[PDB]
């Protein structure tokens, strides 16, 4: 009822696409941040090599509960 | 001719992903709002549950013709 | 004293210009929405054909008093 | 789980303050819009007269479930 | 008639809260600026001191009619 | 070369349209502000009465040279 | 089909007004950029000179098809 | 010394209102983050439960001095 | 060491989805623009027909190294 | 006392650079506006003259205490 | 008087600082783009390595006159 | 590989200027945050004291690689 959350930005990356970039970022975030509650996608970027998409980079706001 | 459009925000949700969240939102919107012309994705959120991405929420601007 | 307003987006269009696009949008909006109080221009676009301006499109926030 | 929400802007007003302006807006909105789920305060204004605050105006994003 | 308004930013402050910070700012503004018409809240800040909220600072757009 | 400018917001109004609202605002501003150099249109609003545009309100950033 | 567009910013200018500033900008843009599809007005500025509005400057996003 | 600050987002919650949501968030933040200096309110949200306000959520930028 | 980049907006389109809209836009952009380095998604739209998604349109900032 | 601040925009200019443009603007502002407390840089522009940087313009929010 | 300008984004880089990053970008831009008139700094970034600033990156809006 | 980054805000301060404020912030940040990759300048402020610029405050987004 009086829960407090903290939000930081995490950047997930994947050669495969936006969806996998998000999962990679959330998976890695979950290991150092406990109580991950939600994320909001705030930016989608790509690294190009020739005219080909080499890396997808997804910036997410990530909310997590502070312990009580 | 001189078509007039209205725009409101709709939030589509799905356990499955962004794509299905959008289709669910558009399908349900289409049943009360007629002449849907376009949508603009404005926000993508996810709820985590049991260490999984449980729910996707996509906020869309949805434009519809007033005229038929 | 404690009046409540609602705001939606309306897109007016006109071959003539910005001013007529707004009037067309307000006139058409006034026929389904009652008690129109104000509008705020949020976007002005033009559709070009053969490098000439065919259509003006003006997106407006439109506020209206809710009845009782 | 596959619920769809719609969001519009509602402006509550009160001579008394921000809090009462919000409650007035939500109360009146709840009478035409069913299944009100959340609101987000987006703007707080005042009408001034003789260097005194006569009216508070609070613009809120208001989300409501579409029936199923 | 064809009234003209000017708008500047005013920062009200109070140890007590947002509401009193606004009133303090408007009261002090009204003494040098005549014909105050409206304000729009643009920013709410707080200074923490000894692990307590010591000051609230509210930035407001303040509109006033120019004399004729 | 080392000229300093100040910028404030002025709201011009006219029953006739955007262009006349701007001229009315600039004319009235020029009487109390000296050395008016430029303006930038930042907002266009209207007061509606029935479904008819009664007043146009144009907010302008207005720059003026400080004397030396 | 799967048309690709490019968008750049163009600033049209005119002593006469906003409308002519836009036409001047679009006309000149159309001579190096082919397949102009749309423009979005993003900024309207005016230079004052000799107590008159001397120059209008309109910044437009201009979209053009790559394809013909 | 040339003091360095860090800023994160914290979400305070309260059934009671905005003011208490802020205090709850700041109090809880102060227990893991040392040397809290300031906060800026960036979002105020409310959960409705059968058309009554159940829960307030306030997102704040929170600045704190890094030790030396 | 002192590389210079340029950035323009590109709109990719696809009947298939966001991912393919981006690839189509990047592929076509790479044929007139050399040394594509990165892209940033700035807008995702869909054109609806009979309340079904016909076309995805993705606006991207696209950065490319200038030659010597 | 509960101090009240006013904020206006000032544009400082210098042939030399950003830093000197700011100091010129603040110095000149300090002569008509009393009790200058803070500034926030909001825009940095440069005029080119045959492909060399001739003039810097820095727009700043400037806060000053109102007397009591 | 009826001059038309075009604006694109250019990213200058330098190991030395913001000022040199801008000059590098403007110098290189001036070689392919003729009639450079102004720039507006829109973003300043750094590449960090071993907690040290290796590269400065400055994104600038750059305006240039189209030939007549 | 599929590197994950985190981003927080850091405020560097210096009596000397923007450049030194950034370096002070990055240096102090590097001592608690490992694997600093980039920063983005988001805000530049100055405190005025005795009619002089006493402190520069630069807010930066700071990205760092998460360990694996």
Automatic annotation (TrEMBL), chains A, B, C, D, E, F, G, H, I, J, K, L:
It holds the Pfam family Dodecin. Signal peptide: none annotated. InterPro entries: Dodecin, Dodecin-like, Dodecin-like_sf, Dodecin_bact. It comes from the Bacteria. This is Dodecin family protein. It comes from Streptomyces davaonensis (strain DSM 101723 / JCM 4913 / KCC S-0913 / 768).
